[PDB]
Amino acid sequence: GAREGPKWDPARLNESTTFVLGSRANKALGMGGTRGRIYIKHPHLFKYAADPQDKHWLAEQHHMRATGGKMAYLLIEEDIRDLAASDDYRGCLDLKLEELKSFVLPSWMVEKMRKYMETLRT
């Protein structure tokens, strides 16, 4: 097998396999970039804004309370493998989805995450 996924097969992942923040994400998507093929090439890439109340919990998982610099975002890790096949991310020497640091939201956060998605789902 290869190491271009979470463990062996990134496709096996579901729509709720995990979530990836918006910090240090460039790494998994090649550090040698400019803006982000995920925020341009993937105009249909699901994105969940980290509310001010949720940030409290996410901060514990991120282990870094960045006042600013960049806006964090929660995206389905499964959707990453797709965007990873972009024009640039396509087999990038600095592409390591295995270290996407993705994680599944708790039964608490998912609450607002579900009702929220419904807005962009229906």
What DSSP character marks residue 85?
A: T
The 3-state DSSP class for residue 77 equals: helix
Q: Return the structure tokens found at 68.
A: 């600013």
Rounded to an integer, what distance in angstroms lies between the CA atom of residue 96 and that of residue 68?
25
Rounded to an integer, what distance in angstroms lies between the CA atom of residue 37 and that of residue 107?
31
Please give the method by which this entry was determined. NMR
- Classify residue 42 as exposed, middle or buried by CB count within 10 Å of its CB (0-12, 13-18, 19+): buried
The residues, ordered by sequence, that sit 6+ positions from 79 with a Cβ below 8 Å of its Cβ are: 42, 45, 46
